[PDB]
Amino acid sequence: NVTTDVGANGWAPTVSTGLGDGPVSASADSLPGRSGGASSEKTKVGSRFSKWWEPAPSSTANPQPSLIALNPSATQSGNASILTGSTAPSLLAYPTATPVPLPNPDEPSQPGPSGDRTWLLDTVTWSQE
Amino acid sequence: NVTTDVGANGWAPTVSTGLGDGPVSASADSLPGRSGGASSEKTKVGSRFSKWWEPAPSSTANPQPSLIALNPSATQSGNASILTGSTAPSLLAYPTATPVPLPNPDEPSQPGPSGDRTWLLDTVTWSQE
């Protein structure tokens, strides 16, 4: 629905020719390796060329009460837990993405429950000023 | 279950006779016309005689909370809406009745949403005196 060329999301034979030229595009790199990159979702070598020498949160149908009413929830991580007795927002801002092949071959070192836990980062004062 | 005559809810042949008379009663008038009268439910002429010249709201099983608790409801009419966050009475005092044939033949003029709407009738003060 546009006069401009948005790209065919890849490389086509009819794009670059000796009779006519269109805008060049990059294709997706197909790489092997260990799955990583995306958090909460991550879980013989030979060259391919011959050598010359080789042969809903917000909804009116579900209104959440004020501080007065009982509406408890909790957040847990590792051996840490934080409770509340009233309406509290608790949302993953963005949905988790799909894992990708890593360029490095080394196996990862994981801290586990000792690292992935809820830590008391800081205690601060909130004044009316 | 009464000694008195409450009426047979109509006109019977045995009521008025030359040998005996009972209390006369009126019958229902069967009339044609446009359906009207009852609100929220309303939606060739020839004479029948020859001429001489012619050939639960309140229930203990469902107790409604005080002003403190969340118990929202709303009332809408036209483009007007009134909300509340606590227990609120909202009752049609009497059930709507059945429509009746109108004596007048003219088609009604309706204001629609511009007329049937919730209007701010008045603002008044309620003192302890």
UniProtKB/Swiss-Prot annotation, chains A, B:
Residues 98-111 have a biased composition (Pro residues). Residues 19-46, 56-82, 94-118 are annotated as: Disordered. Residues 72-82 have a biased composition (Polar residues). It is found in: Virion; Host cytoplasm. Interacts with capsid protein VP1. Interacts with capsid protein VP3. Forms an icosahedral capsid of pseudo T=3 symmetry with capsid proteins VP1 and VP3. Together they form an icosahedral capsid composed of 60 copies of each VP0, VP1, and VP3. All the three latter proteins contain a beta-sheet structure called beta-barrel jelly roll. This is Capsid protein VP0. It comes from Aichi virus (strain Human/A846/88/1989) (AiV). The lineage of its organism: Viruses, Riboviria, Orthornavirae, Pisuviricota, Pisoniviricetes. The chain holds residues 183 to 355 of 2432 of the full protein.
